[PDB]
Amino acid sequence: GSIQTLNLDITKVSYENGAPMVTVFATNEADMPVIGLANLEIKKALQLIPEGATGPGNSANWQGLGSSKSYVDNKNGSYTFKFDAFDSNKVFNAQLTQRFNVVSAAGKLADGTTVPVAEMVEDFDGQGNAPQYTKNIVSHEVCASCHVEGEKIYHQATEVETCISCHTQEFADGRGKPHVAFSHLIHNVHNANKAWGKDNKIPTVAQNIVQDNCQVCHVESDMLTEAKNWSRIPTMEVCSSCHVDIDFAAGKGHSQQLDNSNCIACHNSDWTAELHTAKTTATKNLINQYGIETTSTINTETKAATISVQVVDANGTAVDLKTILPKVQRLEIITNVGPNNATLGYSGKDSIFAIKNGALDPKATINDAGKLVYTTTKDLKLGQNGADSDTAFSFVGWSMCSSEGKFVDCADPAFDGVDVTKYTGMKADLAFATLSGKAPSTRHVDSVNMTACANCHTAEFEIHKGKQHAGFVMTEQLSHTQDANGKAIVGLDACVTCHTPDGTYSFANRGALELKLMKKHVEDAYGLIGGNCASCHSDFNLESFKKKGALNTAAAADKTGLYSTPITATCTTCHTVGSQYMVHTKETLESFGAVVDGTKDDATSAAQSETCFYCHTPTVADHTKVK
Ligand code: HEC
Ligand code: HEC
Ligand code: HEC
Ligand code: HEC
Ligand code: HEC
Ligand code: HEC
Ligand code: HEC
Ligand code: HEC
Ligand code: HEC
Ligand code: HEC
Ligand SMILES: [Ca+2]
Ligand SMILES: [Ca+2]
Ligand SMILES: [Ca+2]
Ligand SMILES: [Ca+2]
């Protein structure tokens, strides 16, 4: 017995006896009543002091009325709370909005049914009817974009409304610590201008992901009537969380301000909203001005691929590349072979900067039809490694010079791409060709897609933008399949051009795509993701292992490549052999048909000999599952 989702509703609030009696109804995912909850609580009872009541320009704030763990299980899915010590401070005012924060701890019913954590708030007037006014600015869903839903965010709770219900102005005032008010703390912990906590943690990682982008948490909503407070209610307490060098009292960094009375007079909502979103809005507009449509064909005689790039405008109308060449900062074409198991490795792949700072490479031309045309020079070894090796796949990344939200001429032929304020990564593309002229093979894209990446990195993520690459913006341009609802899947299959089974530039980096994303995020995003496979995966495509060969897993002493059988390679990214993270010894893994950091030939020969999935039945919900 296990409940998937515990739903909680406050269905009745009665003040007929003085302190409120609060009834909560608990249901599961099938809307069935949940009887026997042992850890249900009113974590906070609050009332809302309205905007400006504590002084001109000041925020609304949640005044404390107490808490209760005293309830009766009514044996029908409902639970009725009483307060032993309601409103200890004697501040209860029936003219104010009343809030209850209800939490149910993860654990078990008597029958031993597992129950997950649940949290909610609901607001009422002072007689238990619907409320007359609210402070509804954000909703828990925005935090779940980046923080694993149902797990504690830092401490105490899993949903932002619970945080807000404890980290009040009254709480911060009572501790003599303005910074622990939630409206200060939330921006402070994602912004690197000052450290937080006893340890002076500098939020470097949070700053690099959030980038002060208000729209990752402040989202327009009909369900949130105070959503525009982020631009409409400027206060020194909140604005100082990132603007840490102003002293309003002393007029240092700013004209003196002794209260919040005049902030809105100068800091109008339009200006605050525009200035903090201007750069991301401008970049997004630049990215959406142009597209590319890419084709590739194989010469049946020479077995070279010819890649043709059509620039298009926002409407999909042809643009002759000659008209914008002076503003093309880079265009790169990377070609590999065998989309399900790349065969050329990193050193064998075909690659070219066809354009650099307005200059065509001599190997690339613009034809009379205004398309860029480039022919591979590397041996593509088409057809030399089974049916999959009939297909060449070419990834096109490009960038355009830009300044303050406008495209500009690339004025410097040697511009090295380090200063990312001087150009924009544009929409990348993927083109398939076959030697045989049959339909191309394509990689599966049904287990991970760019929608997952975009939850943390935004849809405008210019991947690898800098000295080495133009910046790859991943969109429906390189979609070749739809999901069961007919939505275009934006896959990471193009990334395999470089993220090959042989790795990237070094054999030591687990460069294979099957290893690299999981390696990077277990090392650098563990605080957000940990073991949460669902942060990237809708599914595991375990059938894909039947199309894989050896995967590079290490470098030998002499810098040559060591390889594992593919399931072992994939699991050992996190579960390092010989470490505290892997019970199976090397000898045991070999007993299950694996090659562990051996030769490419031994790993290739054994690649379909692994018995792992006889015992292991991993799902995204539980990757650890065994018979
Ligand atoms: C992605 C765009 C994010 C959204 C939306 C939110 N958070 Fe976040 N948070 C994010 C990162 C990358 C980090 C740094 C993690 C690290 O390992 O350093 C954080 C950090 C926090 C913290 C600090 C605790 C810590 O883990 O360092 C807290 C308390 C926090 N975040 C809370 C939080 C809440 C309540 C959000 C919804 C309003 C929220 N975050 C959104 C990335 C993102
Ligand atoms: C009371 C019931 C709490 C709830 C719910 C949450 N937090 Fe909390 N938090 C609480 C206390 C008593 C303290 C210590 C404050 C102090 O005096 O120093 C904290 C501290 C934090 C901090 C550290 C803040 C800083 O040092 O600048 C963070 C980052 C924090 N809390 C985050 C947080 C989040 C995201 C919550 C919802 C998931 C949350 N807290 C709930 C008490 C309470
Ligand atoms: C999530 C990580 C956030 C980002 C990024 C930004 N804000 Fe935010 N803000 C967030 C929360 C959870 C809250 C508390 C809401 C509540 O119900 O208490 C806020 C609050 C503000 C406020 C206070 C509004 C008020 O009524 O006093 C302002 C003025 C505010 N936020 C502004 C703001 C701006 C300008 C940001 C981009 C630079 C921004 N926020 C980012 C969560 C997050
Ligand atoms: C961190 C999440 C921030 C919060 C909260 C606030 N601001 Fe901010 N502000 C932030 C950044 C990263 C920048 C630079 C923006 C850019 O792209 O140029 C700003 C800038 C300002 C400015 C203009 C710069 C100046 O020198 O005046 C103003 C006037 C400004 N911010 C005001 C402001 C107000 C009134 C806030 C509370 C509502 C506020 N900011 C919060 C980051 C963050
Ligand atoms: C008009 C007379 C003002 C009043 C009243 C307040 N502020 Fe202000 N502020 C004003 C200007 C002209 C600027 C510089 C704008 C620019 O783009 O250069 C500012 C700047 C800020 C900033 C940003 C500081 C920085 O980035 O260096 C913040 C965070 C800020 N102001 C907040 C603020 C608050 C909270 C106020 C009421 C207490 C307030 N300001 C009053 C003009 C005026
Ligand atoms: C939030 C839970 C994340 C999801 C989902 C994905 N990524 Fe991520 N990524 C995340 C963090 C916290 C970091 C480290 C940031 C730091 O400052 O250290 C990363 C790092 C990357 C990098 C490195 C480049 C960078 O811009 O920092 C890349 C290239 C990257 N991530 C790509 C990426 C892709 C393609 C994803 C979908 C498979 C993906 N990430 C998911 C947080 C999160
Ligand atoms: C060749 C032109 C490449 C293409 C196309 C892509 N990547 Fe890459 N990536 C490349 C190298 C040479 C390296 C460094 C060596 C290494 O293997 O680590 C990388 C690195 C990454 C990383 C690690 C963090 C980082 O350095 O940014 C990640 C998470 C990564 N690459 C992801 C990735 C994705 C999602 C791609 C398709 C959108 C992609 N890369 C393409 C070389 C090349
Ligand atoms: C985003 C940062 C990821 C997280 C978190 C996890 N995985 Fe992953 N995984 C990711 C990518 C980009 C790929 C490559 C897809 C490709 O086309 O090669 C993978 C691949 C796997 C595979 C191979 C089978 C497949 O579905 O493609 C397995 C078995 C796999 N990943 C397992 C796995 C587990 C168990 C995770 C949680 C502990 C996990 N992944 C997280 C990106 C990310
Ligand atoms: C990093 C993205 C991971 C990859 C890739 C895989 N696993 Fe994993 N696994 C991971 C974590 C963070 C944890 C929790 C560790 C803990 O605290 O216990 C796990 C756990 C397991 C377990 C249960 C633990 C045990 O001692 O057996 C199993 C059985 C397990 N993982 C299996 C497994 C398999 C078969 C994988 C390849 C398909 C695999 N994991 C990849 C993180 C990651
Ligand atoms: C049945 C006879 C098994 C075969 C065949 C393989 N594994 Fe296994 N594995 C098995 C058990 C009972 C456990 C422990 C489960 C638990 O919850 O404790 C495991 C564990 C792993 C783990 C997790 C390791 C850790 O966290 O310490 C991984 C990554 C793992 N196994 C991988 C794996 C691979 C790659 C195999 C084929 C070569 C393989 N296992 C075979 C049972 C069995
Ligand atoms: Ca209700
Ligand atoms: Ca909830
Ligand atoms: Ca900070
Ligand atoms: Ca295309």
UniProtKB/TrEMBL annotation:
Binding of heme c 2 occurs at 143, 146-147, 190, 201
Quote the record's binding site residues for heme c 3.
154-155, 163, 166-167, 175, 177
Q: Which residues bind heme c 7?
A: 443-444, 447, 518, 533, 536-537, 541
Q: Which UniProt keywords apply?
A: Calcium, Heme, Iron, Metal-binding, Signal
Residues annotated to bind Ca(2+) 2? 119, 159
Q: Domain Outer membrane cytochrome MtrC/MtrF-like spans what residues?
A: 135-277, 492-624
Ligand binding (heme c 5): 239, 242-243, 276, 279
**Annotated residues for binding of heme c 9:** 571, 574-575, 623
Molecular function in Gene Ontology: metal ion binding; oxidoreductase activity
> Locate the Decaheme cytochrome c component MtrC/MtrF domain: which residues?
16-128
Q: Which Gene3D superfamilies match?
A: 1.10.720.180, Flavocytochrome C3, Chain A (1.10.1130.10)
> Binding of heme c 6: at which residues?
243, 254, 263, 266-267
Q: Which residues are involved in binding Ca(2+) 3?
A: 188, 191, 194
Residue numbers binding Ca(2+) 5: 608
Cystines in this chain: 401-410
The record, for SUPFAM superfamilies, names: Multiheme cytochromes
Identify the residues that bind heme c 4.
208, 453, 456-457, 521
Protein name as catalogued: Extracellular iron oxide respiratory system surface decaheme cytochrome c component MtrC
Native species of this protein?
Shewanella oneidensis (strain ATCC 700550 / JCM 31522 / CIP 106686 / LMG 19005 / NCIMB 14063 / MR-1)
Organism classification, top ranks?
Bacteria, Pseudomonadati, Pseudomonadota, Gammaproteobacteria, Alteromonadales
